């Protein structure tokens, strides 16, 4: 029944007292006497110690030690001694898992046994696959029928100049295996030209959906996935805004169609105006920018890892999240369930 | 002078009227009449056209065409035809969308020198973005060797690279991806302030080395004296951090506003020091990658001059377990012990 202070906890004198911990859990305790007491109790858990054994080394009243212990424990600043038993390649992720009160070995085991479909292997698919690969996802299935170009080299970090002309899935698989040879990687030569094509995509723990062709691709994927009982996550960008979510979970979350948050590009009343709309939109080419692609891909992968690891809530559950690049701004669009929805409702 | 409609533009019927543009510049036009006149005007510029030519081509009054043309132009939805004129031809749409001539931005990047001070997770991600964007010269600074544990974040590294020098492998991986650039190596960790004088002059330093603990304090003081721009990037466990972007004589410095509490009474301060010395960051690739991506965006913008970097006078945090972004003011201070 040992507890141990997590390596990821730091403290600092600040204001009238001090700070405890770093990151989201960072707490500012105003009282100096309380803060110093928290330091004293945490010091007693540097070595794996039971409450009683640590208390025996404390020079503070037991009621105080008890409240600090409770403070430290609820925030996962101290964890079960066993959670620290590991040299392993995934060790740095372990402190992250510990910090959320999870058993590192258990999260890792859930990842090993996971199967993830990368639907679209462009800039998003590249960054997501490599995050998932090097974090220990057991099986990654790459789906794309495109070929590598020279213009790809901006965001598609796995690809090199010599890769031009080769299949995307082929080079990603190669580049993933060189990073994590312990995992299984397959590839499926398919682009979704029609809704029907979706039937060729295998079942998995989740689909990572980032292909943007055709323009209503996410509408197809959603409809299909609702009917197939298949979890998926969308990620991409709308020029300078990084976008990730929703993360659809059958029966637990809203689908893409529920809230009707995005406008349908092509379509008006007047034909004269409608033709022009359709031509302007048909010539659309996104203003790609690695930093935007990278943010979108990174937060998407974090959500997949938490979805499968089960240690913290995915951010994009019931939400489509945007992060700006030309201003300091983050916005989430509501995508919770609608009983009225014609796709997943009634 | 011809004008052309940017390919990054898109529109959609929405609400009372419709939306013009994608991303940051997206504007809901409520008045359907106005929304329609914007598309009619924009339609004339799909293929390059002069103002006057398009005016006759458009089936709308001169007074409306003027306002609509102005709207499109002020938003860089339509740009000078010459701006439409490659490897980096993907980043060109991005620069156009900010009203910059992409060729002249690209030229600035080719003429730039960037120091990557620390080649861990952040240095890996920053360096590859800058390289593939066409930053002309990159100076890689690190003395550590690749460990298997690195592979989780440090995206340029593979299982076969374990044991080799980080600087060495980044360099090879960079040249594989962009052969048009030049990369430099300096085998050096900053364990002593004086090691900074071995760090060359550059357009900007990307600083992400996390040891010693007061590294950013050594960089701050040195860069002020050296009139050297720098940007710090990293993370506080699960929070991604980038900024400040220090610009000599324009911004505050790290020390100015004192936004951070230093890590390091007889009994307690010995215990604090003991705890903090055992500290290891709870690293996580998604967090690493965000800080790095936005760091890189700011360097590109700082050098490219086409848009204001976000981290001027600001230290910015993005949470990963909450939907949250927060910046801390790093405005200039006359009482600062470094640049007051």
């Amino acid at each position: 029944m040992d507890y141990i202070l997590g390596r990821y906890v730091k403290i600092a004198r600040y204001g009238s007292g001090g700070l405890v911990g770093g990151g989201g859990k960072e707490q500012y305790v105003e009282n100096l006497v309380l803060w110093e007491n928290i330091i004293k109790t945490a010091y007693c858990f540097i070595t794996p110690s039971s409450y009683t054994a640590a208390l025996e080394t404390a020079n503070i009243p037991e009621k105080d030690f008890s409240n600090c212990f409770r403070f430290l424990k609820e925030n996962f600043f101290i964890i079960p001694g066993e959670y620290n038993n590991s040299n392993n390649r995934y060790s740095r992720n372990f402190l992250h898992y510990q910090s959320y009160g999870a058993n590192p070995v258990l999260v890792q085991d859930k990842l090993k046994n996971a199967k993830v479909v990368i639907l679209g292997c462009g800039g998003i698919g590249n960054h997501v696959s490599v995050i998932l690969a090097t974090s220990g996802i057991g099986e990654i299935i790459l789906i794309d029928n495109d070929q590598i170009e020279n213009t790809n080299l901006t965001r598609q970090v796995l690809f090199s100049e010599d890769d031009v002309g080769k299949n995307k899935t082929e080079v990603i698989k190669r580049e993933l295996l060189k990073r994590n040879s312990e995992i299984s990687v397959s590839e499926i030569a398919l682009n979704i030209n029609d809704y029907t094509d979706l039937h060729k995509v295998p079942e998995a723990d989740i689909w990572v959906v980032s292909a943007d062709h055709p323009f209503n691709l996410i509408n197809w994927v959603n409809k299909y996935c609702v009917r197939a009982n298949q979890p998926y996550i969308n990620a991409g960008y709308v020029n300078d805004i990084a976008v990730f979510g929703p993360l659809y979970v059958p029966g637990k979350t809203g689908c893409y169609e529920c809230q009707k948050v995005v406008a349908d590009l092509y379509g008006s009343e007047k034909e004269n105006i409608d033709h022009k709309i359709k031509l302007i939109n048909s010539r659309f080419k996104p203003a790609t920018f690695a930093p935007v692609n990278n943010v979108a891909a990174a937060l998407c992968a974090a959500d997949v890892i938490k979805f499968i690891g089960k240690y913290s809530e995915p951010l994009s559950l019931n939400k489509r999240i945007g992060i700006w690049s030309d201003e300091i701004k983050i916005h989430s669009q509501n995508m919770g369930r609608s009983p009225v929805c014609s796709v997943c409702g009634n | 002078m011809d004008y052309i409609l940017g390919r990054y533009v898109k529109i959609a019927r929405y609400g009372s009227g419709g939306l013009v543009g994608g991303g940051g510049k997206e504007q809901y036009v409520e008045n359907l009449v106005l929304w329609e006149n914007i598309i009619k005007t924009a339609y004339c510029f799909i293929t390059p056209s002069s103002y006057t030519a398009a005016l006759e081509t458009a089936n709308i009054p001169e007074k409306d065409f003027s306002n609509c043309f102005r709207f499109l132009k002020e938003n860089f939805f339509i740009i000078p035809g010459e701006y439409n004129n490659n490897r980096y031809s993907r980043n060109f749409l991005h620069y156009q969308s900010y009203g910059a001539n992409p060729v002249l931005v690209q030229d600035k990047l080719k003429n730039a020198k960037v120091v990557i001070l620390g080649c861990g997770g952040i240095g890996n991600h920053v360096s590859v973005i800058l390289a593939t964007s066409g930053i002309g010269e990159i100076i890689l600074i690190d003395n550590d060797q690749i460990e298997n544990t690195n592979l989780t974040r440090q995206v340029l590294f593979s299982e076969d690279d374990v044991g080799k020098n980080k600087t060495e492998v980044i360099k090879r991986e960079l040249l594989k991806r962009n052969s048009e650039i030049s990369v430099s190596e300096i085998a050096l960790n900053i364990n002593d302030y004086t090691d900074l004088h071995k760090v060359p002059e550059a357009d900007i330093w990307v600083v992400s080395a996390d040891h010693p603990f007061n590294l950013i304090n050594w960089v701050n003081k040195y860069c002020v004296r050296a009139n050297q721009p720098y940007i710090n990037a990293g993370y506080v466990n699960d929070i991604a951090v980038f900024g400040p972007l220090y610009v000599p004589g324009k911004t505050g410095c790290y020390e100015c506003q004192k936004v951070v509490a230093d890590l390091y009474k007889e009994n307690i301060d010995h215990k604090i020091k003991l705890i903090n010395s055992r500290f290891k960051p709870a690293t996580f690739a998604p967090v690493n990658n965000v800080a790095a991506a936005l760091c890189a965006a700011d360097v590109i913008k700082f050098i490219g001059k086409y848009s204001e970097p976000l981290s001027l006078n600001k230290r910015i945090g993005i949470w990963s377990d909450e939907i949250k972004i927060h910046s801390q003011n790093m405005g200039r201070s006359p009482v600062c012990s470094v640049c007051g």
Partner: peptide
């Protein structure tokens, strides 16, 4: 964001 410098 306040507990020490960035890592």
């Amino acid at each position: 964001m306040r507990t020490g410098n960035a890592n």
